């Protein structure tokens, strides 16, 4: 299977390249290897964009 990630805090994006999200939102990772911001897909909005890795945690 896979490891999903969960938002720990709300976040308001400043660019459309980034997702805005709310605490408890779940994401699939598209790319987590290029840097501290991860390209992700929100299972709530269906949108794809970057998320800040310090705002999420893996499902555990």
């Amino acid at each position: 299977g896979v490891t999903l990630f969960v938002a720990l805090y709300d976040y308001e994006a400043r660019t459309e390249d980034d997702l805005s999200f709310h605490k408890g939102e779940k994401f699939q990772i598209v790319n987590n290897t290029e840097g501290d911001w991860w390209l992700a897909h929100s299972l709530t909005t269906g949108e794809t964009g970057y998320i800040p890795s310090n705002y999420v945690a893996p499902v555990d």
Binding site: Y9, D10, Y11, D17, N31, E34, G35, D36, W37, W38, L39, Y50, P52, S53, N54, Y55
Partner: peptide, 12 residues
């Protein structure tokens, strides 16, 4: 710096 490598936001 690419989008992936921007500074992270501070924790709330």
């Amino acid at each position: 710096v690419s989008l992936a490598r921007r500074p992270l936001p501070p924790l709330p």
